[PDB]
Structure 1
């Protein structure tokens, strides 16, 4: 049995008060506590909990749960600005909980996406009583996920989609509607029904509606394309290696945060009890069912297993139950292709063979009917594939880690863009034996451009016997950021550069009958904004002033362009 107290007001160091709801067990004395920090209305528990845990079980088992409205939203006072106040507000909140009669000195946190980022923000506060966190679909580096990426391109659908959704909340939570609320609301829905369209306006930086409702969209995100001091101020990642806080980390192969979720595991696993679970989910689709790819009912987000695992984890770190995680693996992955859950002892997997697959082929690799090949042997002939990238006609995004623009079809069939001249395709022969690829994925390409800046993209694909060409993971490099996200420099036209493309991670067995394929291009819109091929401030350029670029991929013995696949052989 328990009770719930609403809109308990908690004062922050600046005297601003945040609203919390208290779910407290009817018990004898103080209890362990779990805190959730939420910008989507603490009252609206059903909206996010289905992506997390049946956490009332925690309350029934003797934990208190605290759900808080972040600063400036719903019942909390103050002004809302994403991320910038969450370290301090979490630290004051934890301090308050620890002071309460009902808290026994042990606090934990759980939750998904922004409700996971907020846990990293809490963890760096140095509050002893924070004993464990469970960040799901989260990031500790907001540039790298979700707003830009390791390659230096703006995740424009992520930004505009999320901004529209936050805006909708404001209007909808309005105390005394405003005359313009009705039409702002209409207008926000129009963005959400056509995020690609919204992201197509030029200059991108001119956002009359979103810029008004949430100035941060432009002032912070669009106006700071380099990973500069403004981003560094809210990044947690460099502080994670110094922590010793157990973390139960969840990710999804098609989730926008996956690269950064996985990296947090690698950063904390040496110094405390870290756990990892990765399913084949995208941000808006945790069902395991997609338009052209079904993973099986066991791939559905296993909410009761997750609840059980969370309880065990918190029992060990907040209640001191030393053998509570008995029999629980360190790592649990949904391995695609065989479509099975599998235990592992570590991430990256021990015994991963980082294997180059070289680009080759007779004739031109343009289109899926071109001659491009992939091989574990270096190509014997120096050759090159060339295409025109025109910002007015980018390659459309299809699956992958899209968040708001058609974000429910991660393992999308790629055949609709296969006929494009600016999509270079390289495939293995049909496989006679299974090949497992589980780990981080990257490419190293030798490239040149007619332009002083451009982008290069790479996407790993499983080609099925029936023709479906299913997306796995992908990445981009914006060439001015080829060597650093902080201090970009331009390139010289015609010169060949060796660049890396961070393609995040996957786990897939390519079965006999399948092929491994890679697509190479210079755009992936609106997952990433389009490069203008000018060397200029891309978000401030008009479409008319952009340039087309003749881009080229070099391959052969002296330019051994390849993808690096994390090969598991068991």
Structure 2
């Protein structure tokens, strides 16, 4: 139950640069199993992130050592900070160092959330033998797909500016001797904090005299590389995940920006080692289970003690050889919305998932919520088309979903404020008499056409409540140039009909009797995603005045059966 803490122990990397760590070590006779956390937001500040993770001091009382490290160039660590690029090598050297210490019994694990989760995948691919398990929570193994861009090839601009500004504020606040221009830089950073959509609204987007100066990576890496090119593959871990045999306790949230990629990591490692999955109804900044228009119940609050118990059982199994430690612990545990209950599963995706087409249709125009758009499991008998004008100067505002910094505390947002927009097409089933469970990956196949040589298409799945609330579930986007590949974009011919796939990530929701299933289709979702210029140019470099409007069209009927693919579960 007793332990000691040593601060600012300097660990040398291969290049001579030393990273700072704190050592939480139990009162032990010999060497102990060790847990490593790699953190860019000050290893000293444990309270800021731990509430979203585990009561990990319990690990130390139970005989684990915990090592928390400032990443390179931040706080007590030497070197220069650039996101992602140094973390593979630094983690590898750090694990090596730990394995050489007298207090390490040769078993090392990791845990942490977000960036503290990503860093675990970056550590795992080094193949270091002593690393026996990781527990990456709300993390990604493909930085392009999350959180900076996405599978649809659009820039997550609110994510980028919100985070960069958080790092900027952090760099200024942590400075030894304050520079004179700090205060001015700060006011700009606080302004971004209070109005991320405003900062994302400037054109050209790539012109960030503030953020591009405080942290040049924001432009040099992210904004300047809209294609999933070599710069991105260089830091991507995902393709190497299949070759690994490292157990992973993976945590995600239905409304968390990383959810798509978190789930994909599980699918990629489950066949080669003991993987575990836990998914709750949380967003990045809200793990209470309470939202403005949607309450998931007290049991949906991030169950920190249950997580602590599970992590410990996980580590006891893999770092201490306790063969029975994970007895009774499910492989997959999901919070199933609608019924609003935790439920254990044997796999993700669920076995007996029926990937079911729900076809777009209806008489008249599907524009707005009072239009005639329908969803049905039967193909629409009549060939029609819905048409709207998308104008970059007036994009569809983001409401909930997987937003990170711009109002990222209200995932299951009521969609009624945007229901009357002409560029928001609505399609919904009739009122349900039997519950319909949708749990798994969600995507849409749309037959589309544009007046422009590039544009976007969005799809959002929505649960319509009897009282009128239209609650967002999951959403996705496709940038048409990237409709076939995120690597080698080609433009489109105006007027030509394309079949495009829209990756809407995932969800778990029972649509109860009395509810409707609704899909919203549009061509913007700002600032969750930057807005397409409709020009085929380099979007982030275009002035707004120089962008074009586009007349976009959704085709539906027997020859163009646009549909959403729902993962139907029937029990």
* Bin of the TM-score, shorter chain as denominator length: over 0.9
1:417-471 Cα offsets, whole Å, 9 max, x none, are: 0000000000000000000000000000000000000000000000000000000
- 3-state DSSP of counterpart to 2:329: coil
**Partners of 2:313 and 2:99 in 1: how far apart?**
22
**Partners of 1:534 and 1:253 in 2: how far apart?**
34
Return the offset for 1:186.
1.2
- 3-state DSSP of counterpart to 1:208: coil
Structure 1 position 258 matched with structure 2 position 259: yes
1:130-157 Cα offsets, whole Å, 9 max, x none, are: 0000000000000000000000000000
- 3-state DSSP of counterpart to 1:357: strand
1:507-564 Cα offsets, whole Å, 9 max, x none, are: 0000000000000000000000000000000000000100000000000000000000
- 3-state DSSP of counterpart to 1:241: helix
Return the offset for 1:183.
1.5
**Partners of 1:209 and 1:101 in 2: how far apart?**
46
Aligned to 2:225: 224
- 3-state DSSP of counterpart to 1:333: strand
**Partners of 2:188 and 2:546 in 1: how far apart?**
28
**Partners of 1:562 and 1:78 in 2: how far apart?**
51
Return the offset for 1:263.
0.1
- 3-state DSSP of counterpart to 1:550: strand
**Partners of 2:88 and 2:183 in 1: how far apart?**
34
**Partners of 2:530 and 2:305 in 1: how far apart?**
38
1:158-201 Cα offsets, whole Å, 9 max, x none, are: 00000000011000000000001111111101001000000000
**Partners of 2:93 and 2:386 in 1: how far apart?**
57
Aligned to 1:517: 518
Structure 1 position 291 matched with structure 2 position 292: yes
**Partners of 1:30 and 1:103 in 2: how far apart?**
5
Aligned to 2:171: 170
Q: Trace 1:365-444 onto structure 2 (pairs within 5 A).
A: 365-444=366-445
Aligned to 2:65: 64
1:89-126 Cα offsets, whole Å, 9 max, x none, are: 00000000000000000000000000000000000001
Q: Trace 1:14-53 onto structure 2 (pairs within 5 A).
A: 14-53=15-54
- 3-state DSSP of counterpart to 2:134: strand
1:318-365 Cα offsets, whole Å, 9 max, x none, are: 000000000000000000000000000000000000000000000000
- 3-state DSSP of counterpart to 1:138: coil
1:225-266 Cα offsets, whole Å, 9 max, x none, are: 000000000000000000000000000000000000000000
How many residues align? The count is: 570
RMSD between aligned residues: 0.2
**Partners of 1:442 and 1:410 in 2: how far apart?**
19
**Partners of 1:368 and 1:224 in 2: how far apart?**
37
**Partners of 2:344 and 2:201 in 1: how far apart?**
43
Q: What runs of 5+ residues in structure 1 fail to find an aligned partner? A: none
**Partners of 1:193 and 1:485 in 2: how far apart?**
32
- 3-state DSSP of counterpart to 1:32: strand
1:285-337 Cα offsets, whole Å, 9 max, x none, are: 00000000000000000000000000000000000000000000000000000
Q: Trace 1:70-85 onto structure 2 (pairs within 5 A).
A: 70-85=71-86
**Partners of 2:453 and 2:400 in 1: how far apart?**
30
**Partners of 1:353 and 1:57 in 2: how far apart?**
42
1:11-66 Cα offsets, whole Å, 9 max, x none, are: 00000000000000001100000000000000000000000000000000000000
**Partners of 2:153 and 2:123 in 1: how far apart?**
27
Which runs of structure 1 show a deviation greater than 3 angstroms over 4 or more consecutive aligned residues?
none
Structure 1 position 347 matched with structure 2 position 320: no
- Using the size of structure 2 for normalisation, the TM-score is 1.00
**Partners of 1:188 and 1:61 in 2: how far apart?**
42
Return the offset for 1:6.
0.1
174-183 or 245-254: bigger deviation: 174-183
**Partners of 1:228 and 1:201 in 2: how far apart?**
25
356-365 or 176-185: bigger deviation: 176-185
Q: Trace 1:147-186 onto structure 2 (pairs within 5 A).
A: 147-186=148-187
- 3-state DSSP of counterpart to 2:184: helix
**Partners of 2:135 and 2:185 in 1: how far apart?**
36
1:472-522 Cα offsets, whole Å, 9 max, x none, are: 000000000000000000000000000000000000000000000000000
**Partners of 2:334 and 2:457 in 1: how far apart?**
30
**Partners of 1:256 and 1:389 in 2: how far apart?**
25
**Partners of 2:49 and 2:88 in 1: how far apart?**
22
**Partners of 1:296 and 1:120 in 2: how far apart?**
32
**Partners of 1:169 and 1:422 in 2: how far apart?**
39
- Using the size of structure 1 for normalisation, the TM-score is 1.00
Return the offset for 1:214.
0.1
Return the offset for 1:205.
0.2
**Partners of 1:213 and 1:58 in 2: how far apart?**
38
Return the offset for 1:378.
0.1
